[PDB]
Design a protein around this ligand. Structure first.
Ligand SMILES: Nc1ncnc2c1ncn2[C@@H]1O[C@H](CSCC[C@H](N)C(=O)O)[C@@H](O)[C@H]1O
Ligand SMILES: [Pt+2]
Ligand SMILES: [Pt+2]
Ligand SMILES: [Pt+2]
Ligand SMILES: [Pt+2]
Ligand SMILES: [Pt+2]
Lengths: 265, 265
């Protein structure tokens, strides 16, 4: 008589925790959503196969409007699981869904999974040095979001790193690339001139974490902005002040210029 | 031919990903360390039974001083696995090990798993609002660290949440508790009088993340400082100004005082 929030992990269907896989198997109903992120290494088919259940996929509307009409009821009698890419509660508004469940008399449990928020550790940057985070959103119409630019600025002054989730348009099937994100920030630099993001700023790009051969590249915008990083999902990082060892990792593992090694202490 | 960095997850043996188990089982040699953190929900015996291989445990010294002599050699002619709690490379000194693997001419691949960094999402706080992270260290000798206090100050100032790791004596098997951590912050407040951590400060305590029954509690320090949060590990969080939705989750889920709806929002 419970409902389960089970993460699916970063890349393919095997990125799920054993615990999550065994609970999903003994589940009466299985729902899922694939609009919060992109699992570029699998297919609903491979997932259903690994689970041994038919998975009913929900849209953002079904969830943000009819979660308690579509899913909660079934959990007032059976054992239902809600699957999501990566960690179900990270950089999503799903947490509020738990209150819905509560208010509906349904117990909820969270089975975590590998998230991009911690996967950044593979870039060589210290996870504790990351400051506030932000999302580079696609401008739409005459509306041009810029808040993320200020986030990058704030952290930079404190010497902290910035994690930038790139935008996604699941239904339109649009997945922002690091390049597009780099382009937008340049145009925001022009508008604001805070000297926060420029052709020289060092950036880090992580593509397809969770795959066994992800793309990890570091360098100055001008040198990376026109580079092919492979298929999405992509994630962008604007480092703050580096530690020698962070720099060494970036050069030896991310192909950055042996010059960034000279940290301007 | 390769060396695999595999995360074991947060609490028990089922917290490892499916991909991680398959890879580990097919490996020739399997190493693991348990000094960065401990899996309170399990034992080395259950981990060994699950993988079905003899696991050699390495000391902090073993890794930091002789990783290239104990682990890397075997990866020249075999497929070796290095197990670590959480997500690989989230521990500061861990990323550097990949640089060694390369120089020894060894190819390395990272297999992620849930980390505490992403798992705190279960507190209801928004991930993007987390600032710099810090660790509350036990004073000892003529050494009384207080930097973690400033981290909280600079974060709260900018409306950001502070994730606070508690000190662990991994060999002695002794966990710092949320309570002990609160005591320390009170003594530090009483010394720097910056009005950062007082009896009235709202804090969140997370214990045993990763289990189906973790302890999530929120309230004023004066009301939690002597509450029983169960067995370690404990994580302490000093949230910045709350988003109403956050406040609602902490109340409805973490059983927090209604006060926060008017007070901390
Ligand atoms: N495996 C992966 N590799 C690279 N980027 C990833 C990724 N998974 C998610 N991202 C990035 O994260 C943003 C989507 S936000 C969704 C995050 C997801 N809920 C989680 O917890 O992991 C996009 O920028 C997407 O590219
Ligand atoms: Pt039931
Ligand atoms: Pt497109
Ligand atoms: Pt430069
Ligand atoms: Pt091989
Ligand atoms: Pt103790």
């Amino acid at each position: 008589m419970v409902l389960y929030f089970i993460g699916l992990g970063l890349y393919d269907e095997r990125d799920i925790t054993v615990k999550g896989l065994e609970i999903a198997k003994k589940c009466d109903y299985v729902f899922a959503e694939f609009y919060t992120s992109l699992m570029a290494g699998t297919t609903l088919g491979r997932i259903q196969k690994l689970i041994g259940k038919e998975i009913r996929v929900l849209s953002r509307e079904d969830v943000e409007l009819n979660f308690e009409n579509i899913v909660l009821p079934l959990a007032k009698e059976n054992d239902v699981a809600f699957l999501t890419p990566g960690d179900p509660l990270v950089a999503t508004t799903h947490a509020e869904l738990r209150i819905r469940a509560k208010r509906a008399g349904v117990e909820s449990y969270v089975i975590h999974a590998p998230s991009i928020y911690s996967a950044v550790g593979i870039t060589g940057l210290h996870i504790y040095k990351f400051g506030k985070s932000a999302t580079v959103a696609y401008p739409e119409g005459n509306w041009f979001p810029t808040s993320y630019y200020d986030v990058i600025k704030e952290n930079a002054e404190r010497g902290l790193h910035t994690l930038l989730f790139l935008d996604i348009k699941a239904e339109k099937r649009m997945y922002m690339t690091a390049n597009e994100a780099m382009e937008l920030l340049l145009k925001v630099e022009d508008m604001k001139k805070g000297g926060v993001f420029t052709d020289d700023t060092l950036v880090v790009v992580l593509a397809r974490a969770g795959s066994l051969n992800p793309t990890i590249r570091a360098g100055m915008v001008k040198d990376l902005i026109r580079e092919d990083f492979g298929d999405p999902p992509h994630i962008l990082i604007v480092p703050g002040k580096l530690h020698i060892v962070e720099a060494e990792y970036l050069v030896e593992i991310a192909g950055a210029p042996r010059e960034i090694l000279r940290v301007n202490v």
